[model samples]
Target: RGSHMASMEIFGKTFREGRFVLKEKNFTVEFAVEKIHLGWKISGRVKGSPGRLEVLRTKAPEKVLVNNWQSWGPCRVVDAFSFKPPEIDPNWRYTASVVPDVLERNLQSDYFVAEEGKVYGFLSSKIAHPFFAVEDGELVAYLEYFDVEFDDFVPLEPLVVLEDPNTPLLLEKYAELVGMENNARVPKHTPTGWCSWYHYFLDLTWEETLKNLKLAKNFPFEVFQIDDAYEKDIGDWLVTRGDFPSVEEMAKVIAENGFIPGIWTAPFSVSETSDVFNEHPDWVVKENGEPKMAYRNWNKKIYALDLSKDEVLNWLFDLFSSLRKMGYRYFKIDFLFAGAVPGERKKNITPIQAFRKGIETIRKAVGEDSFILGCGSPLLPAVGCVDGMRIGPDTAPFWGEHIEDNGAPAARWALRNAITRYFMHDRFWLNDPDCLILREEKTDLTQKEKELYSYTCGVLDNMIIESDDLSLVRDHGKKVLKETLELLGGRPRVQNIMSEDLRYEIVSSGTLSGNVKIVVDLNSREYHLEKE
Candidate 1:
């Protein structure tokens, strides 16, 4: 519905205003072309369930940004030809939310591509899942319509192409356009909080949570979030486990302690051992009348909620509504790729469509004022629903030197994605650079390493959520956090976005500290800053 503008040259010809058909072996696409600033936009609908349908083919660019299919995967700039896809642990595919087969088969960028200074990005993921790949020395783009029988032609997600000498600014403008097209939600003020994940992990107790709640008051934090360990199972949000109170009581306690109550849930995911999965097998997405395993985590098989089903949507609404009633104002819905997994559903709509429905239902349940932080989500489809989004993989206490940037929980790689995906900040959502691990003890992160991460996140004006044990955080950690917050209120621009050496120069204007410039080399783990 958002299509307009003149035509431009693409796909080997200058396509004029009218619609044309591109016939493929399995299906046909009726498309139209439009001209955008510095480039063209190609978008239209398709009929018949097709395999990977190639849309664009050009000589491969020297470099490209490998945007992953979902959160918690690498979104780094890479050499197109030399890039090696990570070996997929096929069983845990949905946990990281990857198209493992597609990733292994080709050099893939989930929904968009940035070739050096030029960006070819999708504006929506509502109609179909869009992606670009570097295959056979040619940059190829495709839209995958899998596991859906189409009665009618479904609209395609619009593709926007733009190029400029200023890659960061171009990326920013492109995201701005994406925001307008998707009606993205950008919260007025970023929430500062403490989460019980990095410090406690699976060992968090209600007593520790209470201690943190008390300690958090001494710190400048507004939200008290109980992360992963509180719930009995992945899908059993209301049920508590191991020295934890009921879900409602947890929220009430946080609220009574004078903070916004927040909790984490993998809403679309139901663990095999959980009561939800066993009780309602029909509630999940299926393959040949059997529950389809979305991914495996917590040593359990996980199934995806069939968002296309009325019963499933109603249950989701009720679950979120109950949480909201329990005094929760913030929700971090994770493992969201499960909702969008390609599978047989009650309806014939695409997985992208189903995913949108699932998230939209959460938004509707939680109300407009509640903050929904989407994690492990499809970035494009979640634009309007989520107030904040985790833009990278989990950041750990130790920087993973031995691991590659394939969705590992390493501080180094996590911060890397934060730098590369900075354009999404305040446009698609308040880009959650994950949490700040600033504790002086129990962390292998050096002072310089912590400062680099905290300052970079501040410069980008991303969300500031401290994720460490408050008791362990001494003066140095506190100073780093205080200083980081002071560096916000500025709009940032990364000067050398396409740099090959993992170095960046970030400039921010009108910040609380002042107009600032930060130049850092990830290779050296060193930084220099100037405030004007």
Candidate 2:
């Protein structure tokens, strides 16, 4: 919403029409484009307090003309610069049509050459369009184009890349996991963390995952993970001879005691005595041909798994490249909406491309520095390719008649993830609205409902922990995990959300007066004020 270009051009610039305000410090963001030519209609709003909230469309050397990964990357532009003016058709192409989902491939091209007002750039690489080097004649252009209403607001691939018909080619070896790479140079703070599961090797053995690696090298844990008794079947990844004899020797002692060990696969449900369910019973999920279920737990049943077979994506890329050679750097990945239901010969795909090839085949078999998280998944095929998720359920330790009578209070699981912590807290992954069972056992909840659910889950600085046990935790549960780990190591700011008195304003750092606001009702009674 704020503008201040000192220089630019990426492809026909100049868009305007009312509402546009992007203050930085106590946040203000707002955008409302309504253009015509490329038929535009963007809407917006953002009040104050959350630090550096966004509205970016920057232009200063920030070129962007077609982005969807640059309409399938190469840098596209060449149409005509005539050396010997006339014609010599080499499939004579040049359309320069600014946006058709960022132009996937020759969209009515007569030989591409669009520069009636200059500004262009896009990359997601499949290679072919790179050529834009200007040498001081006064250079500065920024491009970013995508029309088809930016595919009704982003995720603009060929009618949204579908090939995941349940899981076939379960993401052709991780179909290059996405997250801005067309220009590359990101860092405006967005690298926050926190999300854990502590199944500490469930019924232990393998000396209880070596005393769950000494309760993960004595607390303040980061991502110690590992759930469901390390498998035997559930699409088996081997390790439970009875709780492991060696799943890469317990992921090398949880990566030699530093942290980040995450595990808990369900790649598409599996288990009916998996061996690919007795050698593929026509790839599960049926209804008229039989099979179904997808959840019974421990007594078994589950099933689901097909992911549009190619021998089930080469057996899930040889079992996640054998757990990335047994080091497993981070991957919580739960039931993942059981490969988007409707199975048994329901081919031609679409359950959002089998949940985007089950999350791009586990981020292409754990590469790009592996770190997913997800859980209970399905939110536009995990947006730009996950880094953290689960914004609800399983904080499981409130025991008021032991939850489930329609269960939900454990501070409504971090207050129903405070309305998606403003459309998913922190960016490009790392919003996880789960696991914070703030100690003090048999919880009927109160001490101001456990300090307003530990100060509104410590004012949305996500990826913070508290899975109970801090050696018999209590003293206001280790002072709410050392004051929510020094207010999640400072840097969160969202100063308002009264939402007709559901109440909120959490700004611990990045200043907006003081922080903490959380209020509650219907007898669950919690309260807090500050930030006058």
Predicted model with the maximum lDDT: 1
**Per-residue lDDT for 153-216 in model 1, tens only?**
8777777777777778878988998899899999888899999899899999999998899999
Query: Candidates' lDDT values, in order?
Result: 0.85, 0.45
Q: What are the models' TM-scores?
A: 0.95, 0.32
Q: What's the count of clashing pairs in each model shown?
A: 1, 36
Per-residue lDDT tens digits for candidate 2, residues 145-189, read 100011122221210111222211211111212233322211233
Stretches off by above 4 angstroms in model 1 are 1-19, 23-28, 48-51, 94-98
Scanning candidate 1 in windows of ten residues, the lowest lDDT window is 1-10
